[PDB]
Amino acid sequence: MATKGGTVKAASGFNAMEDAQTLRKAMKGLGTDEDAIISVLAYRNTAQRQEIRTAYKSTIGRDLIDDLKSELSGNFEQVIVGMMTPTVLYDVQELRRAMKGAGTDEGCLIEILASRTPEEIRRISQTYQQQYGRSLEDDIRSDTSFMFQRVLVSLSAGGRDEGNYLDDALVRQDAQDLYEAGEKKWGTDEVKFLTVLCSRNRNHLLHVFDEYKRISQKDIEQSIKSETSGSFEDALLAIVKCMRNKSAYFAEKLYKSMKGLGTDDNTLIRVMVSRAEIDMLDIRAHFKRLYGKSLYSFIKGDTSGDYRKVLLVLCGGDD
Ligand SMILES: [Ca+2]
Ligand SMILES: [Ca+2]
Ligand SMILES: [Ca+2]
Ligand SMILES: [Ca+2]
């Protein structure tokens, strides 16, 4: 009830070798058995899917992920491969993809860097270096600029204060500083905003937000919107939403990824996959609260085929 949890749980009586043979069997003939692949992979958690990769490489003597890529395509392949990717590496590969090539997927960078915990970020930074031979900070600096770059670099350090300690004097001054640096200033001391928003512990910031409303008669979101713009504004706003309620933040991302013509499949897939074993239950609750419709109704109405089948398993039910 409290921290609801994920929608993908460990399968009972798990046998990695058996599941591996099922997948091998499913990809052996003229025409792939997609439902068989789903029946196994969507119903095993990330840890179990890894044991299946190992077992597959043993008995079969082949790479499970590469073979799946050879028989699958489109969005169905993208979601399956994501589900097959180890937790930290998945985020790493998403950040890399967000920056590699012309332009940058700002939404993805902001999303991962603003919603991941200090500990999840340190792991991400370490695996990014391992995977690509350059630091995450290095690539951020190469793909982004100015204050947006500045904030992303700070988030990538994973240095936010931990704990829930409330230093009242600090809360009052932070609110005052943010007020002096924005509303009462011609222009904006953007580094003060990013510094306060990136380094203070969650509880502290929630109280800073209240104190700021108290002295300025404006929500910090209203001032951020009126004081900043572009990607810097987007980053700052994401940080605030993730501080107020992370599950609600993702609910809104899901909504926005499907609302309107077509689908932002990259966002839809990344969110469903990355939060399936963490707070999908809470995301579902917040999603229906915010929009009056279940996340299930949206996924079913925006997708089809095998891709839709897998996404609905990650959703884990209607509301
Ligand atoms: Ca780029
Ligand atoms: Ca100002
Ligand atoms: Ca603005
Ligand atoms: Ca749509």
Contact yes or no for 280/315 (Cβ under 8 A): yes
CA–centroid distance, 157 to ligand 2, in Å, is 28
- Quote the DSSP letter at residue 33: -
In angstroms, the CA 147 to CA 190 distance is: 7
Contact yes or no for 106/234 (Cβ under 8 A): yes
Domains in the chain: ranges and CATH: 13-85 (1.10.220.10), 86-159 (1.10.220.10), 160-245 (1.10.220.10), 246-317 (1.10.220.10)
Q: Quickly tell me which residue has 């204060």 as its tokens.
A: 161
CA–centroid distance, 258 to ligand 4, in Å, is 4
How far, in Å, are 42, 123, 148, 176, 212 from residue 208 at the CA level? 42, 29, 22, 9, 6
Q: Which residues of 8-36 are buried (b: 16+ CB within 10 A; e: fewer)?
A: beeeeeeebeebbebbeebbeeeebbbee
In angstroms, the CA 86 to CA 35 distance is: 22
CB-count burial class (<10 Å; 0-12, 13-18, 19+) for 92: buried
CA–centroid distance, 180 to ligand 1, in Å, is 35
CA–centroid distance, 145 to ligand 1, in Å, is 11
CA–centroid distance, 106 to ligand 1, in Å, is 10
Which ligand is closest in space to the CA of residue 145?
1
List Cβ neighbours of 248 (8 Å cut-off, separation of 6 or more).
241, 286, 290
* Six token digits for residue 20: 């591996």
Name the residue type at position 284: R
**Any idea what the Cα angle at residue 286 is, between residues 5 and 209, rounded to 5°?**
100
How far, in Å, are 2, 129, 208, 220, 305 from residue 106 at the CA level? 32, 20, 27, 22, 29
- Among residues 207, 209, 279, the alpha carbon closest in space to that of 247 is found at 279
- Among residues 47, 303, 79, the alpha carbon closest in space to that of 94 is found at 79
* Six token digits for residue 18: 């058996």
In angstroms, the CA 118 to CA 233 distance is: 22
In angstroms, the CA 118 to CA 122 distance is: 6
* Six token digits for residue 272: 């469903």
Q: Which residues of 186-219 are buried (b: 16+ CB within 10 A; e: fewer)?
A: eebebebbbbbbbebbbebbbbbbebbbeebebe
In angstroms, the CA 238 to CA 108 distance is: 11
CA–centroid distance, 214 to ligand 3, in Å, is 22
Experimental method: X-ray
Report resolution in angstroms.
Answer: 2.0
In angstroms, the CA 165 to CA 119 distance is: 18
CA–centroid distance, 145 to ligand 2, in Å, is 21
CA–centroid distance, 203 to ligand 2, in Å, is 26
List Cβ neighbours of 262 (8 Å cut-off, separation of 6 or more).
none
